[PDB]
Amino acid sequence: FDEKDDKFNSGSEERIRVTFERVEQMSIQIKEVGDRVNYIKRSLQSLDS
Amino acid sequence: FDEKDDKFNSGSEERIRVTFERVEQMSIQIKEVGDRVNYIKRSLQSLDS
Hints:
The structure is cut from a larger assembly and holds 2 copies of chain A. By secondary structure, chain A is mainly alpha-helical. In chain A, 71% of the residues lie in helices and 0% in strands. The first copy, chain A, is built from 1 helix and no strands. The first copy, chain A, has one helix spanning 12-46. The longest helix of chain A is centred in the middle third of the chain and has 35 residues, at 12-46. Chain A binds chain B through residues 12-13, 16-17, 19-20, 23-24, 26-27, 30-31, 33-34, 37-38, 40-41, 44-45, 48, and chain B through 12, 15-16, 18-19, 22-23, 25-26, 29-30, 32-33, 36-37, 39-40, 43-44, 47. Chains A, B: Residues 17-49 form a coiled coil. Chains A, B: This is Transient receptor potential cation channel subfamily M member 7. Chains A, B: It is found in: Cell membrane; Cytoplasmic vesicle membrane. Chains A, B: In the C-terminal section; belongs to the protein kinase superfamily. Alpha-type protein kinase family. ALPK subfamily.
C-alpha cells in the first residue's frame, strides 16, 4: 500500500491535476492580493500626508 | 452531455492548456504587483518621515 502511491501519486496525470487545482486556487489569491495591493496603494499611500 | 466533459475537461491536454493560460496571465499580474510593491516601497516607505 505504500508502493501503491508510486502510481496514484507521482504520475504525470496526477501531478498535472494537482497543479491545475493549485494554480486555479492560486490565481484567485493573487487576484485578491493584487486587489489588496491596489487597496493599500489607494487608501494608505494617498493619505501619507 | 455531462459525461462528455470527462474527455474535454479533465484530460491531460486540457489541464495543461488551462494552466498555460492561467500562468501566462498570472505572471502578468505578479509583474504588475511586483512593480506595485516597488512603487509602494519607493514612494511611501521613503516618505515615512
